[PDB]
Design a protein around this ligand. Structure first.
Ligand SMILES: Nc1nc2c(ncn2[C@@H]2O[C@H](COP(=O)(O)OP(=O)(O)O)[C@@H](O)[C@H]2O)c(=O)[nH]1
Ligand SMILES: [Mg+2]
Length: 169
């Protein structure tokens, strides 16, 4: 069965683990160790194709930098997550975009921009600002809430569809 290797990146505290756990286990966790990096496997059906998602929930620094390069080189698509109430997390997207492109040595890497925590009233990054960034990158942008589940399937399924478009060239 086809497997898609997905990697979730972004600043600490944006909701990478909460998003992953909602996708895999269908519930919201308010408390999940910010230092835990692990992979989850989930069989799903996307556009009629039964496939396996192999998702790496990243946690930032690695014991050795070679471990970061290894997962960036082997990952097929990347969910770049910021939180709509954390401007620093949005500014950090530039760093994640540039770093993945450098490790893969490619200008065409399947990526989706995710603005998480859209259930919160507090917002410091308006939608337009993120739409403009995603346009400059040529990638989709999805607002999500790991708490309410809004957009969660869409974010991950859209990344799979971006990977498919890349593979068919
Ligand atoms: N209200 C709200 N809180 C969230 C959401 N996603 C994550 N959180 C909270 O933000 C904190 C950090 O989330 P976490 O998944 O650990 O982020 P990570 O460091 O990127 O893995 C946790 O306390 C979660 O309760 C969301 O969509 N809405
Ligand atoms: Mg985490």
């Amino acid at each position: 069965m086809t497997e898609y290797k997905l990697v979730v990146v972004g600043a600490c505290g944006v909701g990478k683990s909460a998003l992953t756990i909602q996708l895999i286990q269908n519930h919201f966790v308010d408390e999940y160790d910010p230092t835990i990096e692990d992979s989850y496997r989930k069989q799903v059906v996307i556009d009629g194709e039964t496939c396996l998602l192999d998702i790496l929930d990243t946690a930032g620094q690695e014991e050795y930098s070679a471990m970061r390069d290894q997962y960036m080189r082997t990952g097929e698509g990347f969910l770049c997550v910021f939180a709509i109430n954390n401007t620093k997390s949005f500014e950090d997207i530039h760093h994640y975009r540039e770093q993945i492109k450098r490790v893969k040595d490619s200008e065409d890497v399947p990526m989706v921009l995710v603005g998480n925590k859209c259930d919160l009233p507090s917002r410091t990054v308006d939608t337009k600002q993120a739409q403009d960034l995603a346009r400059s990158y040529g990638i989709p942008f999805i607002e999500t809430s790991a708490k309410t589940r809004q957009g969660v399937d869409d974010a991950f399924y859209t990344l799979v569809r971006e990977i498919r478009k890349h593979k068919e060239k």
